[PDB]
């Protein structure tokens, strides 16, 4: 119940690879209403990304089977996993909208959280239909675009947060919004403008930047 205890236990859960527990601890810590440090926001993101990652992988397997199929068992179990995934995404989005975005006292935090919002709406969009999907896509776009605006004002082009956001927004354009031209435009501009400064970077800086830029290049190769 003390915040320090929750953080301590999140760190233990991380070492123990208990990501659902880790997420729950971090949710409790967020709900104390104080900002998260860089270390702490990374605990939050790692935890929830592992949980949703498992659900997303399962959902893709079941959805694929269900499609090739076209009894109710596959559909039923796919729906069970889908509901669970929606639940987790909604939990993360609730933390972002009830605490994290508005309480963030600096631009870097704000970009990190608005990117997270875009990401979790994107994960919802992957499973969504109908009016739900329309609402979700609009919400994802709005979050990502706000994040983009701040990042272009506040961060240099090789900054890993800025690059990761641009990468994920480009994926949104291609995979979710069915806007390949916007996806390609964004990816190319992002890569080109980052490449322009990589010669000024140190060893560890360059690696962090280049790892994300490699994904920008991989995507462009698939999309072209």
């Amino acid at each position: 119940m003390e915040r320090a205890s929750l953080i301590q236990k999140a760190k233990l859960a991380e070492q123990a690879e208990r990501y659902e527990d880790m997420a729950a601890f971090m949710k409790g810590a967020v709900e104390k209403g104080e900002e998260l440090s860089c270390e702490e926001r990374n605990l939050l993101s790692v935890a929830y990304k592992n949980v949703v990652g498992g659900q997303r992988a399962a959902w893709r397997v079941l959805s694929s089977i269900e499609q090739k199929s076209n009894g109710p068992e596959v559909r039923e179990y796919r729906e069970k996993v889908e509901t669970e995934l929606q639940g987790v995404c909604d939990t993360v989005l609730g933390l972002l909208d009830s605490h994290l975005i508005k309480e963030a006292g600096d631009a870097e935090s704000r970009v990190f959280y608005l990117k997270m919002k875009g990401d979790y709406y994107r994960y919802l969009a992957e499973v969504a239909t109908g009016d739900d999907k329309k609402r979700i896509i609009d919400s994802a776009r709005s979050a990502y675009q706000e994040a983009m605006d701040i990042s272009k004002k506040e961060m240099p082009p090789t900054n890993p947060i800025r690059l990761g956001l641009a990468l994920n927004f480009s994926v949104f354009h291609y995979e979710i919004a069915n806007s390949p031209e916007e996806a390609i435009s964004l990816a190319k501009t992002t890569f080109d403008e980052a490449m322009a400064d990589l010669h000024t970077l140190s060893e560890d800086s360059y690696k962090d930047s280049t790892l994300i830029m490699q994904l920008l290049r991989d995507n462009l190769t698939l999309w072209t």
Partner: peptide, 10 residues
Amino acid sequence: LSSSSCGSNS
């Protein structure tokens, strides 16, 4: 191959 998001290559 498929579209890759941030963190997918570790």
